[PDB]
């Protein structure tokens, strides 16, 4: 009632379009530089992520630098889960929000094989098997977003509160919408440490490719891999 689970869904649908019909009809069952492309989707989706966050209730009435802290801390996993949930539409690889479809050859020959396969077996293959609904996705992310254990928050006792309201709302929804699946709400949250462990192995790759320097990294993605000055994020949140 204060964090309407429907308001969360509106946010997800506003920043993520439908599964494309080519993907629906052909992708499923029954070389341009993978990494550059992956970092290009990352930068692209970072602008999207700010727009998504502003639609998630009460986020935008936080102190401005709290929103920065929350977003900077969780942007990594908010984007990994979002792309993992798109990829359940396809059979085998990952679908970036640029439309690009990556394989376990384009990933193995790129050195990102292990993380690639991990995301397949742990996020995609499990979001698919339990058929992860978008409202659940939008709530898990709101949870990942509202992390009060992040350093510098003016009032973690609201980010805590707002995380609690998502928790209560997602719990009510998960009960309502899936009674036949009783432990479903706790199987979603179980993906969080799986997300984190995968989320950090990606920064562990993003930094390794940032250091080699032979991987183009756009402005917003650069700002995220850079210790706080942040011009872009801080600007967007006021608009």
């Amino acid at each position: 009632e204060d964090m309407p689970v429907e308001r969360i869904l509106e946010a997800e649908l506003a920043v993520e379009p439908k599964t494309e019909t080519y993907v629906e009809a052909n992708m499923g069952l029954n070389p341009n530089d993978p990494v550059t492309n992956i970092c290009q989707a990352a930068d692209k989706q970072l602008f999207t992520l700010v727009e998504w966050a502003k639609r998630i209730p009460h986020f935008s009435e936080l102190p401005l630098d709290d929103q920065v802290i929350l977003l900077r801390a969780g942007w990594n996993e908010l984007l990994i889960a979002s792309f993992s949930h798109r990829s359940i539409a396809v059979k085998d690889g990952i679908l970036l929000a640029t439309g690009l479809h990556v394989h376990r050859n384009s990933a193995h020959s790129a050195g990102v094989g292990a993380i690639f396969d991990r995301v397949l077996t742990e996020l995609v293959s499990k979001m698919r098997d339990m058929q992860m609904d978008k409202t659940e996705l939008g709530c898990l992310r709101a949870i990942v977003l509202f992390n009060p254990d992040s350093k510098g928050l003016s009032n973690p006792a609201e980010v805590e509160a707002l995380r609690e309201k998502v928790y209560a709302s997602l719990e009510a929804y998960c009960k309502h919408k899936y009674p036949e699946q009783p432990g479903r709400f706790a199987k979603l949250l179980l993906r969080l440490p799986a997300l984190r462990s995968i989320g950090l192995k990606c920064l562990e790759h993003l930094f390794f490719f940032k250091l080699i320097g032979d991987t183009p990294i756009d402005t917003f993605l650069m700002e995220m891999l850079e210790a706080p000055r942040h011009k872009i994020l801080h600007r967007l949140l006021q608009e």
Binding site: E122, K151, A168, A186, K187, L189, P193, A194, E204
Partner: protein, 293 residues
Amino acid sequence: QGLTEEQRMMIRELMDAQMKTFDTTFSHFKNFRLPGVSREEAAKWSQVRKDLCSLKVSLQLRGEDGSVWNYKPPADSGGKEIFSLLPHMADMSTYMFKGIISFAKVISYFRDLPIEDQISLLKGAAFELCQLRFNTVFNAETGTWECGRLSYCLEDTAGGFQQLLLEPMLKFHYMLKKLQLHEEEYVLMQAISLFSPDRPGVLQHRVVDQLQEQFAITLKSYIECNRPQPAHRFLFLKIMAMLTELRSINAQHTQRLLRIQDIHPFATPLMQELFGITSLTERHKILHRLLQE
């Protein structure tokens, strides 16, 4: 209470494995060593210093009589000193891990799981388990790990306000001990963490997956039942936060250990195995030995 028989008989199997392999007094911890009486190689040491700096502790050690020994570590400088608390730490590890590879080894589900995946599973949860156990002996008020006769007290930058919270490894323990968990809740986090499906190398992924799920609902409902209702409502959420933060703390630790080992080979062959330092049953020769006799 308010559980399934299978659920309550799985907590019982953990609490069993716990006290059967977790001596709260560390009585059999013996013979452990103590701190006695380029431009790139500099950037390495520069970072290695920042690891151990936020992690400075006194080593209050008690004897049977009431004599208290006490080791106050050196202050930050160059050269090899924090390395001194390190063979002590190395030996504390070999005792902690041994009691971890026995916690798992005596768990029925873990027994049934094939060797190679038992090996894989420990390697991913080894460090994650030690902290879960060490939090059972942590005192937030005094900031020490009361490991029986041995104590590890937190040094004070400006004692007025710590902000040792700026070190995630510490903040975890303060965040965790704040929740005030029961022994069942603690041992349930240990199995959720021990039976994580995303550990590198796990072959029978489905079994471990469904297992972690089982331990999850069990922990979810222990809190719904045993603890009061509009009071501990947002627990498990808080516990889940900790199990997530554990993946980071494990992440931090491993890269940390890698760097220190690189400038100071100090790893027990056990440490090497658990943290992969230079077929899977053949590669892990000694972890192989500890399981199956």
